[PDB]
């Protein structure tokens, strides 16, 4: 008789940038997944979405961030791209669910919403669930970048606007990653 606070990540006023996504650790729950189930995408890997309440786990993590509609397809195992390799990487053996919905009425300011950033390039490709929130300017030559010749800034912004087409307008995505450890299951649905 103790409901799980899923709404805290789904009903958030603001989502983190994809280059610096937020991670919420959820435990000690009676985890009804009815609460989170018009969404753009609802696809699960390794877990049945119809009766997900019956199969419970040790812990679940909710990874939340905002991207553009035509980058949603990169939030999946086995995929590559500007986001999959440099911003948010999923493991090829994911056991969980990626939930996405249109946020054009929230984030797409008519003035241009520049509060959301993504990484253009990286030292090395990211490992699964690895995060890199360093915004240092890269010096390709031997001159200080005090931004000038041979100076590159890793992050670029999503210029979200209400006048953009569907693939170029913002979507809010929450990835629910389920795991089993040596501990007994702690996050289980009602019964």
């Amino acid at each position: 008789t103790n409901l799980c606070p899923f709404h805290e990540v789904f009903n958030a006023t603001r989502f983190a940038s994809v280059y610096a996504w937020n991670r919420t650790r959820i435990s000690n729950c009676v985890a009804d997944y009815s609460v989170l189930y018009p969404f753009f995408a609802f696809k699960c890997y390794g877990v049945s979405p119809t009766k997900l309440n019956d199969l419970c786990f040790t812990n679940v993590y909710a990874d939340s961030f905002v991207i553009k509609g035509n980058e949603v397809s990169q939030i999946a195992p086995g995929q590559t791209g500007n986001i999959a390799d440099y911003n948010y990487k999923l493991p090829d053996d994911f056991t969980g669910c990626v939930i996405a919905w249109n946020s054009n009425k929230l984030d797409s300011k008519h003035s241009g919403n520049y509060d959301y950033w993504y990484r253009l390039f990286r030292k090395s490709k990211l490992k699964p669930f690895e995060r890199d929130i360093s915004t240092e300017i890269y010096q390709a030559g031997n001159k200080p970048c005090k931004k000038g010749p041979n100076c590159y800034f890793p992050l670029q912004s999503y210029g979200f606007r209400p006048t953009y087409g569907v693939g170029h307008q913002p979507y809010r995505v929450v990835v629910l990653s389920f795991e089993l450890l040596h501990a007994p299951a702690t996050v289980c649905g009602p019964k």
Partner: antibody
Amino acid sequence: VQLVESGGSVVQPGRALRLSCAASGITFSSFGMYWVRQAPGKGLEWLGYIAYDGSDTYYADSVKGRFTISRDNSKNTLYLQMNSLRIEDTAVYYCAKDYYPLLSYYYGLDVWGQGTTVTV
Amino acid sequence: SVLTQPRSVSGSPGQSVTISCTGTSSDVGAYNYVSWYQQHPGKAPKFMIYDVDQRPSGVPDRFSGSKSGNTASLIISGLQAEDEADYYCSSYAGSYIWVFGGGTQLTV
């Protein structure tokens, strides 16, 4: 950052040929490099790519297992080792610089060399 | 898996033309990474439009583009006499492989 292309010649089919280009300045070590081929009267064909750190290298299926891409970080030069050249392998070969430094890839080719002519 | 283009596109100074290239659902449709290059006779290709509509400093505002389904296109407005060049598109085919289109010759 000028790309100076060389190593082109007229060669007999079945033989090997070494192509290369030198990158001016000291920024070579920061960027991945691409090879592109353009046969006379035809459009462009992608040949391959080598990462700035020399770790990840990719090839177009057409030349996979035949051509090898490598680089010398100390000399600031890029190499293409061609093997078993065929009658059809007559083209101008270009090297090009990745628009962005380090690992980037999904943008395009910003800086191009003049092109090395290879015939058979 | 080579992208298909018009051999030649007609037009005249002051007008606008479009140059389309088509692929399949596995390349042009799946990934929004279409890059267009402008080549002159006797000269290496110039980097023009990247990521479907975006352009590197040095590219005139008259050069744009768009994408719909599995078709990408280069949009040139206000054609000038020196815009006479061979244009190519390049899409990401997946698995770290790129594909150049057949090439389109623009006329004025």
